[PDB]
């Protein structure tokens, strides 16, 4: 039953999102002072990367837990479970941060409060931080429901075209099932128009430039 899988994806998503959606929205009034922004900008590139690296690592463990709890995934061979997570975990982290993004004031939720891209200046990757805000702004524009983002992030993960898959049929099958679920659920709710406004490799290319940098922080 497609309906079991849908309820499973939504359950796991509800249980594995690091921050509650009510808490992010209640916190949108809480914005970093220019003093606080100065404090972050003053930090060494080493310090800012270590502290962001730490946050990213923690987030990936929530995507790992999201994958493990969503049944059909645990039935794939361990090799394929590893290939899909390493290929998609960060892309899933990126999609998720659009919930912690306020398009009203181009702010993202970060270590307790909200701030703009100028907070991350010490990373010395303004291009990349701009890519991340732009992508979050585009995604916020869809006004996803929790169910829509749960099902979308499941398809970000269950992708039969990832290189290095052993049982490429068993992944196609799960992906095809998630597609039927997602397409049916959008069509039944007249939400099918958002499929045009979804990014293409654009999740892949976004982080390519800077990602293997994280290995020397851990
Ligand atoms: C408690 N946890 C949190 O609040 C969450 C976890 C995910 C977002 N987050 C942050 O604290 C956080 C919030 C906003 C931003 Cl802009 C950032 C910094 O983001 C990144 C900086 C460097 C590299 C990043 C890269 C790449 F791929 F480049 F590593 C990729 C992604 C997607 N984000 C990068 C971070 Cl680390």
Swiss-Prot record:
Where does the record say this protein resides?
Nucleus
- Annotated domain remarks: The AF-2 (activation function-2) motif is required for recruiting coregulators containing LXXLL motifs such as NCOA1 and NCOA2.
What does the UniProt record say this protein does?
Nuclear receptor that binds DNA as a monomer to ROR response elements (RORE) containing a single core motif half-site 5'-AGGTCA-3' preceded by a short A-T-rich sequence. Key regulator of cellular differentiation, immunity, peripheral circadian rhythm as well as lipid, steroid, xenobiotics and glucose metabolism. Considered to have intrinsic transcriptional activity, have some natural ligands like oxysterols that act as agonists (25-hydroxycholesterol) or inverse agonists (7-oxygenated sterols), enhancing or repressing the transcriptional activity, respectively.
Share what the entry says about its subunit structure, partners included: Interacts (via AF-2 motif) with the coactivator NCOA2 (via LXXLL motif). Interacts with the corepressor NCOR1. Interacts with CRY1. Interacts (via AF-2 motif) with the coactivators NCOA1 and PPARGC1A (via LXXLL motif). Interacts (via AF-2 motif) with PROX1. Interacts with FOXP3. Interacts with NR0B2.
Q: Which cysteines are joined by disulfide bonds?
A: none
Factors inducing expression: Up-regulated in the state of obesity.
Query: Family, per the entry?
Result: Belongs to the nuclear hormone receptor family. NR1 subfamily.
Tissues expressed in: Isoform 1 is widely expressed in many tissues, including liver and adipose, and highly expressed in skeletal muscle. Isoform 2 is primarily expressed in immature thymocytes.
Where does the record place the NR LBD domain? 1-218
Protein known as: Nuclear receptor ROR-gamma
Coiled-coil segments? none
Q: Which organism is it from?
A: Homo sapiens
Q: Which disease is it linked to?
A: Immunodeficiency 42: An autosomal recessive primary immunodeficiency characterized by increased susceptibility to concomitant candidiasis and mycobacteriosis. Candidiasis is characterized by persistent and/or recurrent infections of the skin, nails and mucous membranes caused by organisms of the genus Candida. Mycobacteriosis is characterized by infections caused by moderately virulent mycobacterial species, such as Bacillus Calmette-Guerin (BCG) vaccine, environmental non-tuberculous mycobacteria, and by the more virulent Mycobacterium tuberculosis.
User: Lineage of this protein's species?
Assistant: Eukaryota, Metazoa, Chordata, Craniata, Vertebrata
Q: What is the effect of changing residue 59 to F?
A: Completely abolishes transcriptional activity
**Domain of life (superkingdom):** Eukaryota
Give the encoding gene's name: RORC
């Amino acid at each position: 039953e497609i309906e079991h899988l849908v309820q499973s994806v939504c359950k796991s998503y509800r249980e594995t999102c690091q921050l509650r959606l009510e808490d992010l929205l209640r916190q949108r009034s809480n914005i970093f002072s220019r003093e606080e922004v100065t404090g972050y900008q003053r930090k060494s590139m080493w310090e800012m990367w270590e502290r962001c690296a730490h946050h990213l690592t923690e987030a990936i463990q929530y995507v790992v837990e999201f994958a493990k709890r969503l049944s059909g995934f645990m039935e794939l061979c361990q090799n394929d479970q590893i290939v899909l997570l390493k290929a998609g975990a960060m892309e899933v982290v990126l999609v998720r941060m659009c919930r912690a993004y306020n398009a009203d004031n181009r702010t993202v939720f970060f270590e307790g409060k909200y701030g703009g891209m100028e907070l991350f200046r010490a990373l010395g990757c303004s291009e990349l931080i701009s890519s991340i805000f732009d992508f979050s702004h585009s995604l916020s524009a869809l006004h996803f429901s929790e169910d829509e983002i749960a099902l979308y992030t499941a398809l970000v993960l269950i992708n039969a075209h990832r290189p290095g898959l052993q049982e490429k049929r068993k992944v196609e099958q799960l992906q095809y099932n998630l597609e039927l679920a997602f397409h049916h659920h959008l069509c039944k709710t007249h939400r099918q128009s958002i499929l045009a406004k979804l990014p293409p490799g654009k999740l892949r290319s976004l982080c390519s430039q800077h990602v293997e940098r994280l290995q020397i922080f851990q």
